[PDB]
Amino acid sequence: RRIATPEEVRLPLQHGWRREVRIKKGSHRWQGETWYYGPCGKRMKQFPEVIKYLSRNVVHSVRREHFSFSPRMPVGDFFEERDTPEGLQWVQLSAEEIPSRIQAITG
Amino acid sequence: RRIATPEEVRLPLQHGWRREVRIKKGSHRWQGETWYYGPCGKRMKQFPEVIKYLSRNVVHSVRREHFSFSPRMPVGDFFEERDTPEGLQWVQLSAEEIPSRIQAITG
DNA sequence: CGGAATGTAGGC
DNA sequence: GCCTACATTCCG
């Protein structure tokens, strides 16, 4: 029932999980969404999918409080949808671009 | 054509792609399969799917010559399915573990 | 909430 | 072409 630290949200990355934050133009504004990949490669987009995955897989070091769906938590790889006359390209952000995208979707 | 070098296979990884090798036991032996994730998040497991992906986006730094589906090419993250009394369980391999696993899927 | 029903995409 | 495996919708 209390705030998760960056250290804790980095922990599943040391146990075969991946976290991604993806930032697209929505109906009205710029918004971010968080994806997790389980060690098996399963893509999960919602916290109840993670709790369901944890309940049907061997309970090691990784537990429910290690997970955040916040696109404003700087843990994992960041991508954004950049539209140009050549078309919709997705591009991965450098570590240096990330804090300004997070500011842009704070609020 | 010509077999791609580690360096060429690492190129798309600087332009928002991910490469994974995933090993498990089949009928008689252990086998590897290569996955790629495009910068949009799309999972592709076959060479002609990457060709279809590349022709649907703008042709820049990334071309067909940079893609290998060979699970013996030590580029990207490696994982294996281990059968245990608690169930099938995927684990990410350390750099130190990868060579034994590639030797085991040659053949 | 935890599973069954139905839809879809890519594999063969 | 159908089949298999995953994603989404539906249900009490």
Give the H/E segment covering residue B31. Answer: strand B30-37
Cα(A86)–Cα(A104) distance, rounded to whole angstroms?
Answer: 25
CA distances from A84 to A81, A89, B13 (A): 10, 8, 22
Please, are residues A48 and A103 in contact by the beta-carbon 8 Å criterion? no
Spacing of B53 CA from C9 C1' in Å: 15
* A69: number of Cβ within 10 Å: 17
CB pairs under 8 A between A and B: 53
Q: Beta carbon of A64 within 7 Å of strand C?
A: no
Largest CA distance in chain A: 48
- Stated in angstroms to one decimal place, the resolution of this structure is 2.3
Reference B19, options B62, B52, B81; nearest CA is B62
Q: Protein footprint on strand C: which nucleotides are under 7 Å from a CB?
A: 2, 10-11
Cα atoms in the Cβ-side hemisphere of radius 13 Å centred on A43: 10
DSSP state of B24: E
Residues in chain B: 107
CB B43 to CB A40 under 8 A? no
Of A35, A39, A91, the CB nearest to B79: A39
The alpha carbon of residue A51 and the mean position of all alpha carbons in its chain are separated, in whole angstroms, by 16
Please, are residues B66 and B12 in contact by the beta-carbon 8 Å criterion? yes
Buried b (16+ CB within 10 A) or exposed e, B13-37: eeebbbbbbbbeeeeeeeebebbbb
Contacts of B64 by beta carbon, 8 Å cutoff, 6+ apart: B47, B50, B51, B54
